[PDB]
Design a protein around this ligand. Sequence first.
Ligand SMILES: [Zn+2]
Length: 186
Amino acid sequence: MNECAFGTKDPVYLNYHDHVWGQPLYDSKALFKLLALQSQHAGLSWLTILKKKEAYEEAFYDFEPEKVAQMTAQDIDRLMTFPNIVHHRKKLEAIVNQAQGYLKIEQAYGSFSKFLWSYVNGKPKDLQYEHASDRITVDDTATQLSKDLKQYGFKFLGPVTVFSFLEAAGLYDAHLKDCPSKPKHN
Ligand SMILES: [Zn+2]
């Protein structure tokens, strides 16, 4: 478990490793929320964004895309002094652009979940890692998904970030073979 969880001992981070990271997530709105939170990570510890999750929920309508998508510069202006979120204007604007892109995807394609899972043919890609040093941080699929999302107006979701999202959402299973949290795949 310890090796799989990147040597982190903070129990809030371990909780995320144990109960979220890499567990196949098929719900569209939950996938949107996780992707949006991932976009906020750059230059900070993930535990920073995790401890702030409830504050982000309060800032962004519980990440409900129809509601987030309607937000304007006036909202972002207010959110720049909203307590316990990161006050990075382009990061905050990005969440609104992402929600708009989600709605565009659902209009053009049907389901945001089906859109994303299409990139791994509807089931997790088990990366079959045995050592934490086996882990890559980007690949061709994440790069193309990043590019494709960008076309619908998503922001702050480059290739490495998208790769991290795929592992987080369980589209990729990056758990080590003997980790107690490695999901079963059929
Ligand atoms: Zn693990």
